[PDB]
Each structure stands twice: as structure tokens, then as C-alpha cells.
């Protein structure tokens, strides 16, 4: 079993002309086409056997059995979401969780422990190409490491998926490989720490990364690891001050409040869950997980990392202070200014932090802008929110850098790195607020990075094969969608327009939509809802598809005004921890997100990207079950189907000369010689013989490039020709055998003796009981095959096959029935010749008896009035014997004896012998 069935397809665990159709049921099912009516098709299903209606644009072709469970899905002759779903599903139920789709590496979580990832297997993937071994996460790691040394440039591995997809587990395997090849454990201890401060419960997921995680493994010039460091991108700080319904802020908040001791609550000035404004929907629990115990788990996790008690407690103060920000109450009364009638709050805030309570009160209400600017009620709450968002973000970046200090660097060694990007995939909800626009905007550029990468990797592949073909950059397809979101003015995009509407207080979410539609309604990737008044305000076309955005509270969520008076107070804060966070002082949310993404893209574009796709088979977290719709939705989000969309335009199927020859040679039997080889021209002869259209193929240096659907045709022509060639072979060998045996059965020469005759009698009876039956019921098999051939032949939409020289089943048994009547004619003529041979035997026996009886008489009478007495005895015995000898010879002639003169002459010779006997007496 182990580990042989979890990798190789042949080692794994266990012709109706069908096509894929849309379904709910299973993701896709099979159906027989039959009748077509107008522009629509009417089909009928296979495994169930029920009938249903679909369109003709909804029909996706199915791959031949040859392409079942491919390791690389670029090898598929039929490229569509249905085939992609099938192949992945077929491999998953077979125990294979790894599959390559184009450049992508697709890993579906088994939710089991597979006996892979051992030192033997790691050493077995070393120095090998990707196709030389079955799909595995190690090959992608191997691909990165081998390219880093040879291609001299840094590497990056982009992992897409969720937190419960084992994306952390998959990242461990990547590091596991790179560690064994180049010769730590604490890097796995950093994960639960960041998980606390960086993850939160969403609607779809109880644990979701709100930040990008970039793990940089540094290698020296010799290829050995000198250390590692973590970088974080696109942290969501808006989740701290507010959350969507049923959604929670970061875990650490709920862990602290529930898990802290009595002394901790008094020192951190902690309150109830319903007492904090920045906590939406009060206290939300999580199934299977409890925040109280996770708090202690989080503490010790930081202890192992080497965090001192003072450092940890300092972080817990900041977390507490972030929540305390919201509890500050500003009020409004009838001149325009902010007011804080409640002094009990902001005392806690200034105590938790290092700020002077009097300086702060003056600063937050009336900031000093480089002199003494006034702020309103609306400005104050926003300024407070931003301070909480900024402080928590600075807390996070500090936690990262603090972890990086706890990572061992055993060599100074200015080095090169291989990055691992862990980021939340494309998010599509039934609502899709501002946070969803941001995570889609960054994933848009990420998928663009793939398209450009595939564009570069393939165009250098065509050159290596010496094939000249020109295609536009596939990355340019996402460019209009990106410019729709990101551009300052052409005319200003969704982000740029949102920044402008936040500048004016009287603007609303409604005026933002109206201006967005007005500014660009012309954009191809911009669309509006169908009719009436839809929930969502507008829609944007992505690579994943069309998503519906609602602009509610977008102006509120985009506000990130920074108070420069309060920021300076936090920089000058008496608390050394707080002072360090705010040490570096320099503004809309979307502006910072665009800024932070540009920083991430800059680093990735300077490296060589690799892509791993983690898929969740089911929501039930159980093994052996795969939800097809869940997988399909993910395939649209991660860009796997987008990768499929690109290769179809080109020549996706690439087959080497020899394996193309071996497979399809039966289609062109006499085209190819008896194997004078050279192997390239053998394929050029096959294509010429097949008369294959020149637009459907390209001949490279080592390989032949094929369009999608071409191999599907050739594979189908093979199946028909295979059974046809096998039939015409065994048919001729059967027919000729009959013709050769029947010709032998009509042979009338049985031999010259009686022993020879029964020799054929024993051979003929042993023929019917031995040789005939296998040849006899082979006729019944060939007729069954001919019928089976005629059936599968007309399922291909073709014409029936005509067998030449009477090889048809009805002409076979006709020759067989003619053969069986010729056996008795051979057998009956055998017993006739048998009696004849017996009648010759007795006649020849008497002939020899008479002749050799006179022999001794002639001899013993040669010893000699008694003379003429013995002389009379001579002529009487002579006449009597001669008359009897003549009687025997006469009976032999009518029996057609062929030794007649042989006996007759020998008789006449004895007449000379008897003549000597009569002469001797005289």
C-alpha cells in the first residue's frame, strides 16, 4: 500500500459517446446526444438513466479513457471546466491529492495523514524534472530551488486557498523539502502566534487570514540556508474597529477578554464584550473552539518563541487600548465643534498608552497642524477609529519583526531567497462589501502575474522547439479590470472616486454610485444590475467572473484620517513599547491598500513565481467526500480555469515523436516503413498519410504541438482501427487455415499400404476431437466481435464496415459448413480404400504363397521310367498354379493395383527358373 497508491495512477486504489452537461446534483454528469432540435440539443443521461433539457452552448466535450486521471491537465485534448472537475475528482477518489493544471500545482486536502513526506521520498525527488515524477508539492519546491541556483534569480511560491485547506500544512512541506536539500522548527511556532493576531472569523470561515504572509527562506551563494524572515502584506485594520454581521474581529481580542486573570483585567482595564463599541455583534462564539483556552495556548506559544513576560503584557496593553479608543464618547450640541463630556474614558486610554491626559484631550479635540485646527463630531470619531486601526497595524508589524529577531541566522552571508506567499484567495459573497473589493483587486494582479508568467514560460518553449507563433501577453486581459479599480484618472477609478467623495462631508454612498456610473459607464469591465432596484449597486468583471458590489457604508470604511497631534504624542509616549511602535511617523484606506499592494507586487515581479492551489473538498471536514460545486467555485476563483482558458488558444497538447508514433501508427499501417527510424520523419509521414489539416498541428524540434480536440479525434480513430485490424488479422488466419485444411482433406493419396490408410484414420478422428473445437467456436467469437464492431462503429456517427474477400460472419460459417461436409467425403473414401487395401493384402499373400511354394519344389526336384512320371506331375502343377496366379492378377487389376507388372514380371522370371528344371531332366 504505502506510499505507492497515493502517488502513481497505475498503483492507485480502485464507448457510448458521452458529453458533459450542466447539472446541480453532481457538478457535471454524462449524457448521450441523440437528436438535435434547432439551436438546442436534446440528450439523455447515463448512470441514472433519466432525460433532461439543456442548451447547445452548455455542452462541453468529454476526454477519451487515455486521458483519464492525467498528472498534467495541459495534456488533456478536451479543455473545459467539466473535464477539469472530472479529472481532479477522479484522482481524489483514487487517493491522489496532487495534480498539475498547466503551471499550477493543485492539491486537494485529503483530511488524512498520507505516508508521504519521508526522507526516502524527498531524496527521490532530487535533481529530477516535474514530469519525471508524479505530482507533488516537493516538485514545486524542487523547481524553485533548482532554478534559484541555475537561473541566478530569486524565487517565489504563491499559495492560494483558505486557512482550513491545510495551506499552513502545505507550506510546511515546502520548507521541509528545502531544509533536507540544503544542509527551523521554530518557524512552525510562529504560525499560532500570527494566527491569533492576524486571523478572524468570517461568514464562510471560522479561521481566515486577513493578512498576506510572505515567508522568505534565504540561501547563500553555495545554496545553503543562512536563515529566514517573515514579511506581511495587506493586513486588514478595518476589522478591528468594525465587523460585518456574524463576523468577528481578530482572535486575540476574544482570547484576551475571556482568558485574562482577575489581576489582568484590572491592569489592562478590560471590560465586557457588550461594553466595547469596536466589537460588532457583541460576543460571538465559535463551534469546537473556545477563546479562554486559546489565550493560554497563545501565551505559551509566544514563550517558546522567547518572548519575555514584559513584552507580552505590553502587547496586551495595546490590544486593550485599541478597544478603549471606541469607548470614547464625543457629543454634539447647538457652534460647530467636538465635545467630550465624559472624562472617565480617555483616562484609561492615556493610562494604557504613554499619553498625557491633558495633552491628549486638547489634541484629539483641537489638533495642531503644521496651528491649532478645529475638528467636528464626525471628524473626531473617524480620527479615533484611524488611531485604533493604525496602532493595531503597527502592533502587528512589530510582532512580525520581533519574531524575525527570534529566528536563527547562523551566517552573516548577504544572500538570495525563496519566498512563500500565503494569502486569502479570491472572495465572492452574496454581498461583497468594500473589504471584498480590496481582496479581489489584489488577487486580480496576482492572476495577472500568472498570465504573464505563463506567457513568458510558453513563448520560450516555442523557441526551444523552433516553432514560430505569435501571441499577445495574456496578462493584458486583466489590465482593463485593474485600471478600472486602480488609476488616479482615466477617468478616475473606483478607488480614486471613493477618495474624492470622502473629501466632501455632504457626499453619501448613493452619490458615490451615481458618480461611479457617470464617470465610467463606458468601461467594458463595468456593468450595472439588470432591472428594478437590485441589492447591489454595481458590478465589476474579473477573471473569476461577474461579482455584485453593494456600496453601503463604503464612504465610512474608506476613511482613515490621521491626527498628527495625537500621533506625535504616541511617538513621544512615556511607554517605551508604545513609543517604539510609533517611532516612525510619515491618507485613505484604499490609498494605503493600493500602496501596500504595489510594495508586494514589486517584490514578486523581481522573482520567479510558482503557483500552488489548495482546494477544500467539503464543508464537513471529512475524508472521502468531494463537493463538486465547492471545487468548481474555487477553480474559478484561483485562476485554474483561467489558465485553462489561455492554453486553448494555443497548442496545449504536446506529444513527443516516439509516443505519438507508438500510439497512432495503426492509423497509417503502410505509410511508415519497417523501422529505419530517425523518428521525426516517421511522424511527418503519419500526418501526410492522415491528411491532417496543417492548422491543427505544429511540428517542433523534439515534439509535435496539437490543438485541443485533435487527439480526441485520433484516439477515436484508433479504437475503430484497432478492432478492425485485429479482426482482419484473425479472420484471414482462420480462413486460410480452412482453405489449407480442406485442400488437404480433398487429397486422395493415402499411401501404398494398409498401415498408411489407418494412419490417416487415427489422424482424422483426433483432428475433430482436438484441432476443430478451438477453430470451431472462434467462428462464434468472430461473429460476436463483428457485431460488437458494427455497434461501436455507428456510435461514432459513421458508416458500417464492409469486410472484403468474404470475411463477413455469414460468409465465414458458409466456408465452415462447406468444410464440414468435406470431412466425411474424406472419411468415407477412407473406409473404401481400407477394404481395398485389405483385399490386396490377402490376394498378395496368396500370390506369394503359391509362387514361393513352387520355389522349393523347383529346388528339391532338381536332385534328379519314374522320370516321365515326375515329368507329368510338372505340367499339371504348372497349369494349375498358373491358372490360380492368373486369377489373382485379374482380381488385382479391377482393384487398381499399381504394382501389377512388378508381380507379373517376377512371375515370368520364375518361368525361366522352371524352364531350367524341365531342361535339366532332359
From Swiss-Prot:
This is Myosin-10. Residues 597-619 are annotated as: Actin-binding. Myosin is a hexameric protein that consists of 2 heavy chain subunits (MHC), 2 alkali light chain subunits (MLC) and 2 regulatory light chain subunits (MLC-2). Interacts with PLEKHG6. Interacts with ECPAS. Interacts with KIF26B. Interacts with LARP6. Interacts with MCC. Interacts with CFAP95. Phosphorylated by ABL2. The chain holds residues 8 to 782 of 1976 of the full protein. The rodlike tail sequence is highly repetitive, showing cycles of a 28-residue repeat pattern composed of 4 heptapeptides, characteristic for alpha-helical coiled coils. The modification N6-acetyllysine is found at residue 405. Residues 15-64 form the Myosin N-terminal SH3-like domain. It comes from the Eukaryota. It is found in: Cell projection, Lamellipodium; Cell membrane. Isoform 1 is expressed in cerebellum and spinal chord. Isoform 2 is expressed in cerebrum and retina. Isoform 3 is expressed in the cerebrum and to a much lower extent in cerebellum. It is linked to Associated with severe intellectual disability, microcephaly, and feeding difficulties as well as cerebral atrophy. ATP binds at residues 161-168. Belongs to the TRAFAC class myosin-kinesin ATPase superfamily. Myosin family. It comes from Homo sapiens (Human). The modification Omega-N-methylarginine is found at residue 11. Residues 68-718 form the Myosin motor domain. Cellular myosin that appears to play a role in cytokinesis, cell shape, and specialized functions such as secretion and capping. Involved with LARP6 in the stabilization of type I collagen mRNAs for CO1A1 and CO1A2. During cell spreading, plays an important role in cytoskeleton reorganization, focal contacts formation (in the central part but not the margins of spreading cells), and lamellipodial extension; this function is mechanically antagonized by MYH9. (Microbial infection) Acts as a receptor for herpes simplex virus 1/HHV-1 envelope glycoprotein B.
